[PDB]
Homo-oligomer: A and B are copies of this chain.
Amino acid sequence: MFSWMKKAIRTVTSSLKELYRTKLLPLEEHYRFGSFHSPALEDADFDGKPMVLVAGQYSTGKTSFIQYLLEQEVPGSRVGPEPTTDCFVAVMHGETEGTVPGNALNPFGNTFLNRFMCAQLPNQVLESISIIDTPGILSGSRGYDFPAVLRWFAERVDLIILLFDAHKLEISDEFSEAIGALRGHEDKIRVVLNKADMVETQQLMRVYGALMWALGKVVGTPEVLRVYIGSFWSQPLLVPDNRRLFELEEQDLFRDIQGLPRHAALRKLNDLVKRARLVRVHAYIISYLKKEMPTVFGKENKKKQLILKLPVIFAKIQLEHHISPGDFPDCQKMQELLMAHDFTKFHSLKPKLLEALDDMLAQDIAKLMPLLRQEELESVEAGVAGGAFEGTRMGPFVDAEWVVTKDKSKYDEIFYNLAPADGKLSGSKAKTWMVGTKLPNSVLGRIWKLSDVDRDGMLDDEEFALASHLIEAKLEGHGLPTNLPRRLVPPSKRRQK
């Protein structure tokens, strides 16, 4: 099985590749990292185009989202209310429109990727990045391990978009399992609250709350994840109240996903750094077992013991080598994988190699930062090209004193003549006068809303003066502001700022 997915001149990118093969690869290969965690990296991992993964439950809008980013339909995947997508669609660039199934790029070492399709089409966006539509996560058995495959993408992908639909939020257990697989790559996650224009403004808040309340417990990290609220959707808004917010959030995401090529080399560095640590941990985990094993006699029991003692084995290694619990892999898995290996064949601890790795992380990596910083402004305004990211899409358009004080004393005469109690005119009394202006009820309401600044249901002299001013304004032929400007707020009422 193999991936074509990732689609002089001494660059930080190359430097990384050279560092890997020189100071990591030996350490991986000596302690057989590839037979436990992840196989040896290839040039494709360094020279390939950046990728963005899109995941979520059924009917969350993943396929729609990609289509929306593209402003164009996906050859393979189609939109539908019932579970439609049933495979991993690797939406990537193509000279001509069309698709190609799995197995097109001796696999006697057999494949189950036959359920994996590649969609190819000519598109400005696809010149910069390659998007991956995944199958819907089950909500409430399968032919393969779904978390592990996400964990596989997590190591290689640039952005992980997780969708949730405001309409029918469900944070289900197979999902809760999925997140566990992303552990260690929190920073790549971008939670998206889709269909936010479908639920009522109050309801949206509940949903949003619940989601964060949930996600808080699931990922468990103290660093809150950024959510993006919207409807990634070329169609009209069901409820428009929160239009500004959605189109603001959209942009925040689009800017973040646009700069991926510019910020490509850094994530590679960081992910290499992250790998190094797991490699290092693994090394000690193997080495320590081989040390504990006997030469020839009584080994079968010692293996059976050691695997049961593994929790203690980790704990003891954490202490004496000063390494964060977050670096260690899931014990329960190691437990299982270690059963398949011949403990006697394990290699010894070889400080020689470990030192190289350590020195890579200590100095070599520190040295590159200067260069990287230079590369991140030397020439990096490539960005994600046209599509939905295009600017034209937004459209081709885009200290004082109170102004009624001059007419104040005129209004007061009318005010106090209407018998307000305690300097306050009742709503009942205010309406019965206001309507006397012969203005449409609707307008009079909008005036009232504006004028009752302290919102107590009554009008004092200043508020009445304001109301009157507005009534005159509209009577002369003017539009009422949807919201009062600081300027029109009666001086005494204005905020302290």
Interface residues of A, Cβ cutoff 8 Å to B: 71, 201-202, 205-206, 208-210, 212-217, 220, 224-227, 229, 234-238, 240-241, 243-245, 248-249, 252, 390, 392-398, 426-428, 430-431, 441, 444-445, 448-449, 452-457, 479, 482-484, 489, 493-495, 497
Contacts and interface: CB of A to CB of B under 8 A. Distances in A.
- The residue in A209, A214, A430 that gathers the most chain B C-beta atoms within 10 A of its C-beta is A209
Given A212-B212, A392-B457, 9 more contacts: A205-B227, A205-B245, A208-B212, A209-B224, A213-B215, A217-B220, A236-B493, A390-B457, A395-B452
A236 B430 CA distance: 21
Nearest to A486: B236
A209 B235 contact: no
A479 to B, nearest CB: 7
A452 B493 CA distance: 40
A248 B202 contact: yes
B224 A431 contact: no
A392 B216 CA distance: 41
A396 B244 contact: no
B483 A240 contact: yes
A285 B228 CA distance: 50
A430 B393 CA distance: 13
A224 B208 contact: no
B457 A245 contact: no
Nearest to A243: B483
Which of A217, A397, A430 has the most B CB atoms < 10 Å from its CB?
A: A397
Contacts of A397: 431, 441, 444-445, 448-449
Contact of A224 (B210, B395, B455): B210
A490 to B, nearest CB: 10
B494 A457 contact: no
Contacts of A235: 454, 493, 495
Contacts of A482: 482
A280 to B, nearest CB: 30
Nearest to A392: B457
Contacts of A497: 238
A215 B456 CA distance: 33
Top-8 shortest CB links A-B: A216-B216, A396-B427, A397-B445, A212-B212, A213-B216, A393-B457, A240-B483, A396-B431
B238 A393 contact: no
Nearest to A225: B213
